[PDB]
Design a protein around this nucleic acid. Sequence first.
DNA 1: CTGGAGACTAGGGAGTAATCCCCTTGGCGGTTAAAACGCGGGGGACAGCGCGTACGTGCGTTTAAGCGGTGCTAGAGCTGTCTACGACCAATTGAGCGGCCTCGGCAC
DNA 2: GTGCCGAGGCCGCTCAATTGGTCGTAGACAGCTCTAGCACCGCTTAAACGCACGTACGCGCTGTCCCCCGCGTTTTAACCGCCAAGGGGATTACTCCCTAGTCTCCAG
Lengths: 354, 20, 73, 74, 75, 74, 89, 93, 76, 76
Amino acid sequence: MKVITCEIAWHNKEPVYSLDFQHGTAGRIHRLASAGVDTNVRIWKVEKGPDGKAIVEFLSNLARHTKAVNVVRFSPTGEILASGGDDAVILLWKVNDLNKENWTVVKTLRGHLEDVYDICWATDGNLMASASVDNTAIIWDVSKGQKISIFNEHKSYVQGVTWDPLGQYVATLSCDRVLRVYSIQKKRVAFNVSKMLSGARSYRMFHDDSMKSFFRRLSFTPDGSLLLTPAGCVESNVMNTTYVFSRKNLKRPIAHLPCPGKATLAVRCCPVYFELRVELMSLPYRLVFAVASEDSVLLYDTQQSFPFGYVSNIHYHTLSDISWSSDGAFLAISSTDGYCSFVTFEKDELGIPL
Amino acid sequence: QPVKIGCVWVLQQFAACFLE
Amino acid sequence: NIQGITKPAIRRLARRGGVKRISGLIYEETRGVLKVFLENVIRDAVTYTEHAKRKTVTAMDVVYALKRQGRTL
Amino acid sequence: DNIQGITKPAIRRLARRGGVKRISGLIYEETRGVLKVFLENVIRDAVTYTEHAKRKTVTAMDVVYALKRQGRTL
Amino acid sequence: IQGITKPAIRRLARRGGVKRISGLIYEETRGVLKVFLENVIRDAVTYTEHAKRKTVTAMDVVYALKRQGRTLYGF
Amino acid sequence: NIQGITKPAIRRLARRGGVKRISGLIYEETRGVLKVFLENVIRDAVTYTEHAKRKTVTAMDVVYALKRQGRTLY
Amino acid sequence: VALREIRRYQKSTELLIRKLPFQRLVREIAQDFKTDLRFQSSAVMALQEACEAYLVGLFEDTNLCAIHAKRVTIMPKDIQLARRIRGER
Amino acid sequence: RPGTVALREIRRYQKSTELLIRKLPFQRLVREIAQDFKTDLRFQSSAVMALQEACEAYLVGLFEDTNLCAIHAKRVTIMPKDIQLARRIRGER
Amino acid sequence: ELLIRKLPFQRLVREIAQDFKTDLRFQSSAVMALQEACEAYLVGLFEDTNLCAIHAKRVTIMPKDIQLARRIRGER
Amino acid sequence: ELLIRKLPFQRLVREIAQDFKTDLRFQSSAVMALQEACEAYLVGLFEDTNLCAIHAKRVTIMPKDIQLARRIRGER
DNA sequence: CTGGAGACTAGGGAGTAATCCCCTTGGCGGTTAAAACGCGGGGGACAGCGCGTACGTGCGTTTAAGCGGTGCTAGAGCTGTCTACGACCAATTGAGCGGCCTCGGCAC
DNA sequence: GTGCCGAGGCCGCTCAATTGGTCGTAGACAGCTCTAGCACCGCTTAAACGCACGTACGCGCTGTCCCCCGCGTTTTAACCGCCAAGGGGATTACTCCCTAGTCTCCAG
């Protein structure tokens, strides 16, 4: 693979906290969005060069957010943009038909109390799930643009919410070392995962505020079968690790892949399913996903227990966010040092798509 | 020069850990 | 609606504010800032009730909204 | 022993937000006494204000007026 | 407090956009200068004793402008 | 101006205030606090007299000044 | 005659905005947000107190700005400046 | 070493604003004091929350004042005499 | 019964008034009431700062003591 | 780039720290961070003072405008 | 460790700008006639809240053994100060010319 | 009930007597500050516990409700004498542009 570190400042040297690739794009050239402490969300044009090197072309800047922006996401259709900042509001940008392209605010999802950390989307395109420092997860209807569901069972800061692609359950992790999984239809908590036993004492699955990063973004499988949760600790002293759960039972992980030293913080799965080249889940397809820890990026697939790729020693500060591309050719990583990096793969390097 | 690790299905030195 | 905020009411509010004389069109403007204030103080307050999972706005939530604004009373 | 419901670590955390390091063990009784006195001096005023409104229930606004009388409105 | 030069205040106000500057403002600025620090530094020491250190850090100013509600971008 | 509040005057004031032994820099800090106290009472009394259209200052305005401050004395 | 009004009103504390107009203003401004909302009379009391205190402070500092500009009357420019300097806009 | 836990607690708390006197014991205490004053009187939940916030602010402010008092007396540990002097210097009792 | 010399405080309050608004009228009753108020304030401050000083096992009173008394009273 | 010399600001924060307590050193990064913060504070106050002076249809700044902007901002 | 160009200090020049007055036109404060919406109070019980209880569960309190940071308590050690006094030294009373703005008393 | 008028009440300032009040000097010493050592008493898990706390839930009472009405006090509004926000003009004031020194903070 190739890794290119952007040596130029994206947000006036301020740390970058969020990225997303335009899932609505179906070609080879990609569009990216970066969120920074400059109270701006910048949309860039990312394309591989003739030599195979990623090239970033600035397109537009969004300064509507009053304060620093933490999480920015796109809809599955790629036409609806959700931006979250330190103003405890969500801005909805649509196509408006120094900037090269025009972006316009359509909806203002007011109803957050504290800093927003993670924004989640729905497959149908009509539902929001958002997490904030308000110790609450809020679920919204796009067609109305207004709050419809509230989950206030978290006792500390929530740093991640994920929606099941099949559309049945939602997983939220907060700073209280509790993993709360709710049934969307019942609008009540269904599963609680906080303590786990090894060998016969039970200790906390997660670890408290010593993180220097601001995100614990756990992920659902694009098929929804598996839940991947970072920022876990296993007492073998304690070592950092990421746990894998299945839909069959959400309370206990059989397997965890560790990152001794620095703790994993962000996880993201590719939207492209590959043919098969220990296995967590056994179906004739496979999915490739990646985790950004404090100072490294790990790249696993469905079958291999050990990482398929390991990239280390790139950024000078804690990595903030990782985001996969539409076709899988790009992987954008941002740290809190004010600069970002890109992982580019050649054609079908991860595998043969389905 | 920066160090990259690509797609392999030197990598053997970076195994993730379980706990028994 | 806004015309409930009455002109002599603004007169008396200014008088407690120490204003000797009010320009004739301050009334057409001051109500404006009221909305700019109200559309904020109410705006978060109801969400607080939504955050507490109650559909009744309470004085404590309003006081909390003022505290966030910084005009507690 | 209802006033004893205010636990020792609760007073300790109260002190920590107050910005202190070492809390003496003899201060818990004194702080409980002053706290009961403060609650009495605010509850009496809130109760008088509520009875002035001819209501059978004191609301969150009445205690705010009692504090305004005290001088620490919040 | 005289170290804050007259040209310093002059070009400060020029960046502020003014055209004409009086004289009595100058020392006045020093006044409003020190009182600003005369709050912030206390919080710094109110944190430094909390920090149990003798040399202040970059978190002290962050907390100072957080307490005063005047957080500034950049370092 | 301020130097009219001489050192022996503050000495006898402290003696009637209950303190037996006195340091040197209190002689100036007391002038400072006297200035800070007088500025507020004078400001509010001037505002009240302006409300009453009086270049004079009635003693009623002074006791109302103290009431606003909280140190009422007839 | 005006100074009499300022004195007699700074003496008192009772609410200035008429009760029912303010209550209906609050209800109408909440209607556009989302319907079926219940406001306790204590909540409307809190809103009235907050609004009256805000306007008392704002009119105090706009009178300050007016007396700065050697004008006894207060004009909209004073409102805009006391809003901007305070950081409202 | 001893002391670092206290500094961590200060960092956790001064930034934060949550509740320290637990809801139910304070409700019980308020109800008991109400029954002491006059029986058959009802306290709204928001009223108890506001009262507990006022109690919170009063005690944290008076503990800050007694911290200043103890610092003046050249000792870090507080003592009941510090609290008594803080109350008297505040003119309360 | 007052201990602050009368002539000097009258001149002091006139000079304070000239700073706020020039050409201001001060009557004997108002000045005497102001003297009473200032004396009460200063005696209260001295008494309770004496208590604050005797708290630290000291009999004297230094500027830190009056500073602490004023800071606690809420005037700063 | 900054328009205040480093050494005078450094020495003044040092003497004010000495007035607070002895042996409270300062490090360079904190020194420039505080200088940047004070830079922004003073330039913002000067912008507000410019607006206030513009109100009185006089371009020049007068000493009072600063204190009026201060007291409107609710500082003192 | 030694050096020297950008920056702080005074000043001539005057020139742009703050200040005060002059109608002056406009527009903002009484005011009276009234009515009209506001304050208040009386029900219906439908439909909504807090009280109170059972369960659990588990986070948080409670005790103890344990130790070390620290209160304080004794002993210097230097140091400002309240003693007395002798000098100045502002100054209260005793009187004034001279007033002018104000406040109570009186008459229409 | 209110306008005029008289008369005191601070002015405001001397012109002196004597007169209590303040300042400065000397320092013996009471006390602030420091130092050191002791015991003692608040911080720390292990284990027990226990009681907040959440969630549902039957029962029940206090927010409350719109309609009329009672009235009734306050708001609309047009008239109108009258204050003031403002443009223009003259006057006095205070910073720009080198000029030179210098000075010192940053650089090799």
